[PDB]
Amino acid sequence: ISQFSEAYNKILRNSSSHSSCQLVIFVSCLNIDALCATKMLSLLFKKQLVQSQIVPIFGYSELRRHYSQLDDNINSLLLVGFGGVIDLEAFLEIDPQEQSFRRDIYVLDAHRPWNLDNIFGSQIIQCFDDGTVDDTLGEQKEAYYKLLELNDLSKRKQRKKQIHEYEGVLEEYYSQGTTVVNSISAQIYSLLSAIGETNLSNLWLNILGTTSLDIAYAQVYNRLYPLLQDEVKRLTPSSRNSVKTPDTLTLNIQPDYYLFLLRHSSLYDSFYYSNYVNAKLSLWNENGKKRLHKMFARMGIPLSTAQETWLYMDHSIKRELGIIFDKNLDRYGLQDIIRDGFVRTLGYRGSISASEFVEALTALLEVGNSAQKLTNLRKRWVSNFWLSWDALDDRKVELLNRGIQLAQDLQRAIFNTGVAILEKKLIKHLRIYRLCVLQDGPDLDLYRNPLTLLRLGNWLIECCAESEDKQLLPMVLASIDENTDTYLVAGLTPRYPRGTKKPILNNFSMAFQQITAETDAKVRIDNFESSIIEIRREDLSPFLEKLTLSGLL
Amino acid sequence: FRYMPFSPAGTPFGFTDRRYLTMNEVGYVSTVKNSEQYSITVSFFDVGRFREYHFEDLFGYDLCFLNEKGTLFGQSKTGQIQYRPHDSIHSNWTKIIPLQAGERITSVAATPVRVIVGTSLGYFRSFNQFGVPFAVEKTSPIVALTAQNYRVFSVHYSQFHGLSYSLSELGTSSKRYYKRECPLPMSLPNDANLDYYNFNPMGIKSLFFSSYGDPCIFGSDNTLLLLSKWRSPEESKWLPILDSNMEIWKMSGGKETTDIHVWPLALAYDTLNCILVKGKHIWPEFPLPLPSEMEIRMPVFVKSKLLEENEIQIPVSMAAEEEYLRSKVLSELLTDTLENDGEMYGNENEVLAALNGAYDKALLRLFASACSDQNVEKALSLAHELKQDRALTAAVKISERAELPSLVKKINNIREARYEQQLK
Amino acid sequence: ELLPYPHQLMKRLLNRISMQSQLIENISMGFLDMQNESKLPLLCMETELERLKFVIRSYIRCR
Amino acid sequence: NGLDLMSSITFSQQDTNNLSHQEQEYLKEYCDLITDLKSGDLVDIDLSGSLVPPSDVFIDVRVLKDAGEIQTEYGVFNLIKDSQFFVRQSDVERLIQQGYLQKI
Amino acid sequence: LPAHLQQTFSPEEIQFIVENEPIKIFPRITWQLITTDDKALNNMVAMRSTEVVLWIALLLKQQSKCSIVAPQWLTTKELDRKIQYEKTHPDRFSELPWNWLVLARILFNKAKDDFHDPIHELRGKIQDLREIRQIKVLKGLKYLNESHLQLDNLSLLEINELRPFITEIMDKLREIHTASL
């Protein structure tokens, strides 16, 4: 219902004064795509000359202590992706006060399950409803529309069953798993194009966020293979090379690989994550530590000209892999390596693509630093978030490589224990899933912050990415570092070996409502993403007993 | 003869895949070719007034015209046109113009209340701002169009006779003709230069209307022509008030290059807006050039005399003749504009007072030179061209210093004759 | 060494810096009450007074 | 010389804050004298800080190591922990010298 | 009471005296300016020059509703003729725009992406001319007499950089010359 140009002009006139008419935006730090959408919105507000206030919020239980206590004349609140599932208007009471209301938020939710009240019956929740979903549960035109108003003994009895007929279609709905169907990069960049501001930095920025979802889903960005192509041609800066210009930020395309961060460095530590790619084939160590030695130590890898040979004349060897894997194409047919990709340059200072670039932003968000420990743990993640947001200037150079050298040990750290829990053989296929409890190993500290955990699962979902022609169910892990057994347990998604036909989002959050509804015996859902909860030590064993019988898939 | 699609201030493709569709004082419209379609990108100079936008071209439009309210597109092969207003209140409309065998649309134009479409066979189809047809007229084939408000200015070129222009006004009662196919004095031309000639057979680089109501044209001969007194056919004539070759030569130092051309953008009462294009091609490419302003100069010079007297510099005595010709044309047009249309900005009186003061001052420099060479008779004719009464008093002091008592009494007879006519 | 403090011109503009501070005092408040547009003419006026106010801030401290 | 709770010249070098306590009455006789030089100006000119000239009118400023609600005048800015601003120029001059905001 | 930088100017206010000089623009927009040194105009007309002060035009460029014209000596075909009159004249510097160094540094922040091909040419054609000035300044101070110098064409910046040492050497030698008699 909200045409994209209209809300911008409408939010322009509501706070454009040179006083404390302050509009304030909110963003989570727990997602990479959540960042990059906000950054481009801020800078146009700079050149439209408006005063602002940016606050990060990491926790879903924290939202009350950051809004509902400190407000004076904020008319224009803005928020990025928080309330697609839980209704905030039930979470936060706002009485109707002063039909042409006095304070209006927007919302930029990116998730699949929506909330019917937030689009229909909108009076303060001006949601982003434009040509996003044209089929916003198109059967709803009589269910709640007759729920609003609700001899007659035989007539109303039928009328209660029609309500009960409406009740089931609101029972199967609001009982679905979640993803993000369309990235928040897609919306606001399309909005700016309706305004029409030509800067390649924007075109460099919007493609970053959709690149982040390349490891969570598949066919979401497969729709955006044209929308990457047309813009880099329509925003063609030049037909010539027009060489030796230190400026101008030229944009091109070049092929690239799952074997990653190569152009930055280390065909050495590729050896690990080449075996990641052979972990996608049939092994983790055994044949490859012979098999890699047909394809790799063919050239001893130098010290000085390796600044030139695996920077420059590896183009003789990328060609050679390009003429190796063309004859590994009709015979091997493993198509996780050749990819189209995208690249940028700075005139000088090396070529940096966007494949490796999202990798540095994840690790640099991680490291780079009763109830008395969680406060001094929660003040960390907001602070180290902040040194990643300013990473989008040229002014950060010698901090850019800091995350780079950080990243190529963290994988060496995370692979150091993944190989341990395999060889321990503590994965047990009980009946439905597989359960693993990392009770204690070395280096437990790097598992408090949840962004590492999805990567550990991302490595662990791919150890079981062999054929497995029955029981394609992901796992649930367990780890503990701190007191009272906090146990940030989480679930994963099943994966496809590039063949989504079946609708596999999640079943656990439906069950996560169930166990949280039972006894409230020290269970917590205070963390933001529903795929992560907490548990007590004496509750994880009756957790699974409630889960091995409650088959909700 | 081949009927090529013409656009206002358009540039050809060359060895590239991109070009400029149209170009004016509002902005510029360009197209970028990709793998399967075309992509139209519209950029403006005043970013703070209008919202910049772009869209994909599925049909493949090659004709464009830009005014202060919208953008009009046209297809020469299928006759499909589309008008896109900048405001979201007005809805888009699409209609297909009927075309015969071998008929191609050569020029389009748009005003906020009327739509002008011209073809190669001379069919004149006019629409309103909603698409409702009013009349179908059969005239000469239109090859170039320009419009400000009501007026329709078409350049006609047939197969045998050719080279003519028409001037009309789309009034509320009926269409009135001020000129009925008068001959155009534009000079026709007798690799960058080779490719430009095929796409543009007449050599018309750009054409637009001035801010003071006079039609301007800029042909291949690089001479700015000014049509003065268009409301009266008895005194309607073309005035070449600016010569390209003279302006580049004086500012540079006394030389003349080849790669520095002058593309016209707009003329707003003092200078001609331009883009300095440096290179082999005569058409610009994509960098963002800064707009420049060239001061207006009458093309009256000798070439052998400037080399003997030596950026090339012009002396005092020689510049007085050029200053007299420039001020005489501008003062006559500004006087007729205010007495018929009135003020437009509110500061026309200060411009007129400063121009009339410099006109009488420049004539006194030539008046002083005639007295030094003892030519009393030439000095008598110069005194009659003075407008202000204070200029006649200053002419007496120049005459007394040059020891000519007979010339002094002749100035006083002009003063008594003007006072008698003023009291009648 | 010290120079004569030109007090005559200083008080002459010291009246002026009181006035335009009071001129923008009302005309912003007139813009708030008319707000149920242009943000140019406020911001230039706000910065221009304080830059002259900055100059005499140094000028009396070095005395 | 007085920007935010002036007479708290405490939490400051206690081993020498008794040393210069004999000089505090000398020190406060600067402070008393510096007050009437602030008021004895016939118009309101700042004499507390702002020595570097201003350049622009919009400056990105971040915050850390601070909490509470401050800035009752010139509109309350509602300072929450670790949250940047994007404001005009003249307001933050009394807070940067205060040492609450951190980076320009 | 600064007590830090008193005998000279800091480099942040030497730009402050030069920003209050006017140049020419190309306006775009249509009361307006009552800024006690204003000359506000009406609905302003594009494609024309106007002597406008600098610092308001930089602020007018952040909201991006005007454009700047460079001054007339800021082409590469003009600066070359300056380098020949000095290379034949090792005595002094010839012809000086008098505020050129601080003028370029303001002009290279969204005032560079407007002009017609100045990158990889203009910073070439400026940084050479900075040192050629300061190579000339090194031969000059070796020729220091007593209490009489000849500096004819110096930028304001080198004057803020030769300053805090050139005093106290000749001042300290002013003692031993004068206290000898």
Side-chain angles (χ1 to χ4, degrees), chain B residues 214-215 226-232 235-239 329 332-333:
Chain B
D214 287 333
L226 182 63
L227 183 63
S228 66
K229 272 78 69 177
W230 62 272
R231 293 180 179 91
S232 296
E235 59 183 1
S236 295
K237 65 178 72 66
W238 293 96
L239 295 174
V329 178
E332 187 177 2
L333 294 174

Side-chain angles (χ1 to χ4, degrees), chain B residues 45-49 265-266 268 270-271 273 288-293 345, chain E residues 26 28 42-43 45-49 64-65 68-69 75 113-116:
Chain B
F45 293 100
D46 195 359
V47 184
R49 185 175 178 179
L265 294 175
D270 286 326
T271 53
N273 300 326
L288 183 63
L290 294 174
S292 296
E293 290 179 353
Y345 294 100
Chain E
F26 296 97
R28 292 182 164 197
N42 209 313
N43 43 4
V45 194
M47 283 272 197
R48 210 188 292 122
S49 179
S64 52
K65 280 294 289 316
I68 198 64
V69 57
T75 173
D113 45 357
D114 44 13
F115 201 68
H116 40 86

Side-chain angles (χ1 to χ4, degrees), chain B residues 363-377:
Chain B
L363 187 58
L364 291 175
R365 293 181 184 271
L366 294 174
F367 181 76
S369 296
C371 295
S372 179
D373 291 331
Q374 295 298 109
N375 197 357
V376 182
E377 293 179 353

Side-chain angles (χ1 to χ4, degrees), chain A residues 150-156 158-160 162:
Chain A
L150 64 88
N151 171 69
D152 214 350
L153 312 181
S154 298
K155 273 294 293 169
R156 188 196 162 273
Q158 179 47 241
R159 213 182 56 164
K160 293 289 116 177
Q162 291 177 325

Side-chain angles (χ1 to χ4, degrees), chain A residues 195-196 198 233-234 236 238, chain B residues 18 32 39 41 51-52 54:
Chain A
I195 316 159
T198 65
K233 262 77 171 186
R234 200 269 302 274
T236 296
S238 62
Chain B
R18 62 186 180 181
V32 174
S39 179
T41 300
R51 298 292 183 184
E52 185 178 1
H54 65 279

Side-chain angles (χ1 to χ4, degrees), chain A residues 8 23 36 38 88 110 288 350 378 385 420 433 436-437 453 468 519:
Chain A
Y8 185 46
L23 60 96
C36 71
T38 53
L88 82 165
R378 77 202 171 178
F385 151 77
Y433 48 88
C436 51
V437 179
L453 268 306
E468 263 306 311
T519 172

Side-chain angles (χ1 to χ4, degrees), chain A residues 415-481:
Chain A
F415 155 70
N416 186 29
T417 174
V419 76
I421 195 55
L422 179 138
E423 292 283 327
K424 287 173 185 181
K425 293 182 178 179
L426 307 180
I427 46 168
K428 273 80 69 182
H429 192 286
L430 273 73
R431 204 187 66 90
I432 311 168
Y433 48 88
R434 309 186 189 100
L435 162 68
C436 51
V437 179
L438 192 151
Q439 41 180 357
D440 164 72
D443 199 353
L444 262 293
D445 187 30
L446 268 304
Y447 307 105
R448 310 166 162 241
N449 218 6
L451 261 298
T452 71
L453 268 306
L454 51 88
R455 311 207 41 178
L456 170 62
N458 198 11
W459 201 87
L460 259 297
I461 195 49
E462 300 298 321
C463 78
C464 42
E466 64 100 14
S467 51
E468 263 306 311
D469 43 359
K470 190 176 179 179
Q471 283 298 98
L472 304 149
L473 203 68
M475 293 77 77
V476 158
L477 58 95
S479 277
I480 184 52
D481 181 271

